[PDB]
Design a protein around this ligand. Structure first.
Ligand SMILES: NC(=O)c1ccc[n+]([C@@H]2O[C@H](COP(=O)([O-])OP(=O)(O)OC[C@H]3O[C@@H](n4cnc5c(N)ncnc54)[C@H](O)[C@@H]3O)[C@@H](O)[C@H]2O)c1
Ligand SMILES: NC(=O)c1ccc[n+]([C@@H]2O[C@H](COP(=O)([O-])OP(=O)(O)OC[C@H]3O[C@@H](n4cnc5c(N)ncnc54)[C@H](O)[C@@H]3O)[C@@H](O)[C@H]2O)c1
Ligand SMILES: CCCC[C@@H]1CC[S@](=O)C1
Ligand SMILES: CCCC[C@@H]1CC[S@](=O)C1
Ligand SMILES: [Zn+2]
Ligand SMILES: [Zn+2]
Ligand SMILES: [Zn+2]
Ligand SMILES: [Zn+2]
Lengths: 374, 374
């Protein structure tokens, strides 16, 4: 019925940094060749969407943010072969073209068609499908899910199980997969190890889930908000520590509690100082530290290279190291088979029109993941 | 004949920073329990010994430096079980106690008894076996090989093949093992990969040897001294580049020549800026960069954590990651079986008494390894 036509719908537009989202009427153009128009069903509020509002994450404005979501294909442009109208799908903020050097490498996942390194906030063809008040509105990492309808490139969408609960599996579009993969795929947590997880929001909780699934014996959660500790323990943290309770630096405290440094540490916050602290708290000769948190745009950290010369391994990853199009469908299938849980991350559910309230909950420290329904 | 007695012999003592070594008479005490007194046969001049002179590497002075060497056991203290008088041995600047958490971990080699993290420059018992002009002289990483005789702890010595040529296998005590292991063990260079090696001294040449033995397809040598290029090519470099020949930063140049960044990069110099440049030139999603070079004491580098967040792996190692006492004897055995060559690193041979001349050759850029004979 709407196939091949402009759709007029509501979307949350961010017109300028540090302002509330504006629920407005936008026009969404029909999908061009190899493009997929999606009717959104659920979208999570991730800290990275708030980074766009705060200026932490820089991307051309005005913009329709949102990148963690699930929806139903409304229509497909010419040449699309991987999804059909009616299919449940999850948009991929990291594409999987399957032809670049990274897509062909066994460990790479940061596809070279990404819109993160040199952000333009467009479709792959350099143009936008969004218009508001007559003005073109940018996309966000080829996803833009804070809208009733969006249009993505075929390499930025994956078909998922037809029976999946989209108000839950939207978390596989970012939060869950990032945390879980960070532990299980990037760090490769080992059985019996000691892990330290800095930041106990949705991503940090999914890191804990992954460490516990990998058989870690000790999983130490670190947060300055102690209200985060109960849920952290629920999904696997054996201990939790608040840096504000101590008179000495947390890396010392953690080095002492792990009898010389942890096997695996994770930075899941987004601060330069906690990135260096997480590196330091892993065992100097064989420790591994993974950066997951997004740092303030263009800022450099300072660190002593002797931390690495002793033997430490330092790495970072986008989306838990998962090749997005190949893994999203398998993660949904595993969720359907009850291999992991997603309810522990969901603390609040709000209609899409209350998006600003959902961001207020995140910023106040009260929520983990707010799921917005359309 | 000398067993149980103080030995009077010549040693090169460093009384103060930035001065020539002073060839003096020293008194070497007999070995205490679990100690081994070694008659030196050959010692190489590594850049790290020059770092002690320049103040780059800090350790208590006055000191007997030198750590890359081979000699013959003169006598053993009570309780020594792993070596005997007359054995050929190689002193280990990284110990292998075999009991600490690092020694027992499969991938650790930075034994907790090392004298590097908090340098005291003494034997394991906190005292020195060296005296000069009535003053106690410090040890250097439990080795101190710029002396006709030295005393080391049993965990800092390995028994090697009785037929090995000590004027060649002394390089297994540092230079060769470090570079080689950095490629094959730490980085785990893969067949068909592209490697970039910053610094073409003896350790950088050894890194090339390990990349070639791992089957790398391309091995790009980087050095501001183009006189280093011929030998680099001889041992495996497919191309060599001098940063001074270009108008743009070397990481750009290397990213362009590897069509998007190399698989494995190695910092084998000891500069903060080349450590970051080496990291950057490795492929942003799956690249691996290994720091081998020793940076100026207590200085921090500055870097953007986005270099890691895209997927890069950054690591460092001491002694190429080898568990010292288990690996040195195998390396010598491999060398005896012609599994690798050591002659390409040796450009000059001088009597011990010309140690200052040997340091002048290194500092002028003329040599790779000068072997000193006793
Ligand atoms: N690499 C990726 O692919 C990817 C994917 C998703 C999110 N992220 C990033 O991961 C981070 C975490 O995301 P989230 O959605 O879980 O966010 P969140 O805001 O829900 O969680 C962060 C947690 O850090 C805690 N915290 C803040 N400052 C702290 C400090 N100084 N010390 C200790 N704890 C502190 C907060 O109390 C909070 O619980 C963000 O930076 C987000 O942008 C990266
Ligand atoms: N990690 C360890 O276990 C270990 C063991 C041995 C040596 N090291 C360290 O490794 C480094 C190399 O040792 P070496 O004995 O081979 O030293 P070296 O001095 O023989 O070689 C260093 C090479 O780097 C080159 N170089 C200098 N500045 C440069 C720049 N700006 N750009 C590019 N190239 C530059 C020089 O021309 C030289 O050929 C030293 O810092 C040494 O202390 C570490
Ligand atoms: C390291 C920067 C990654 C930014 C990505 C934005 C959407 S997802 O939350 C992570
Ligand atoms: C990272 C510092 C290691 C310094 C050690 C001194 C002797 S060997 O050259 C390496
Ligand atoms: Zn790709
Ligand atoms: Zn996200
Ligand atoms: Zn050395
Ligand atoms: Zn040990």
């Amino acid at each position: 019925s709407t196939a091949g036509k402009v759709i007029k719908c509501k979307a949350a537009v961010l017109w300028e940094e540090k302002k509330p989202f504006s629920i407005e009427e936008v026009e969404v153009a029909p999908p061009k060749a190899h493009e997929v128009r999606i009717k959104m069903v659920a979208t999570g509020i991730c800290r990275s969407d708030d980074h766009v509002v705060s200026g932490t994450l820089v991307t051309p404005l005005p913009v329709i943010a949102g990148h963690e979501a699930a929806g139903i294909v409304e229509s497909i442009g010419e040449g699309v072969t991987t999804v059909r109208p009616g299919d449940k799908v999850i948009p991929l903020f990291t594409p999987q073209c399957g032809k670049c050097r990274v897509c062909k490498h066994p460990e790479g996942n940061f596809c070279l068609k990404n819109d993160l390194s040199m952000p333009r906030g467009t479709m792959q063809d350099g143009t936008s499908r969004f218009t508001c008040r007559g003005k073109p509105i940018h996309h966000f990492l080829g996803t833009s899910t804070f809208s009733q309808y969006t249009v993505v490139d075929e390499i930025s969408v994956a078909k998922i199980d037809a029976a999946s609960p989209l108000e839950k599996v939207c978390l596989i579009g970012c939060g869950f997969s990032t945390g879980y993969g960070s532990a299980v795929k990037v760090a490769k947590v080992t059985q019996g190890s000691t892990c330290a997880v800095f930041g106990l929001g949705g991503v940090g909780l999914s890191v804990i889930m992954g460490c516990k699934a990998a058989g870690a014996a000790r999983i130490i959660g670190v947060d300055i908000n102690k209200d985060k500790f109960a849920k952290a323990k629920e999904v696997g943290a054996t201990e939790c520590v608040n840096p504000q309770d101590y008179k000495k630096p947390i890396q010392e405290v953690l080095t002492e509690m792990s009898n010389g440094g942890v096997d695996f540490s994770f930075e899941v916050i987004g601060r330069l100082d906690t990135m260096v602290t997480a590196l330091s708290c892993c065992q100097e000769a064989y420790g591994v530290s993974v950066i997951v948190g997004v740092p303030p745009d263009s800022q450099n950290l300072s660190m002593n290279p002797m931390l690495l010369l002793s033997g430490r391994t330092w790495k970072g990853a986008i989306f838990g190291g998962f090749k997005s199009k190949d893994s999203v469908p398998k993660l949904v299938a595993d969720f359907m088979a009850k291999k992991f849980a997603l309810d522990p991350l969901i603390t609040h559910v709000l209609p899409f029109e209350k998006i600003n309230e959902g961001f207020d909950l995140l910023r106040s420290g009260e929520s983990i993941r707010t799921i917005l329904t359309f």
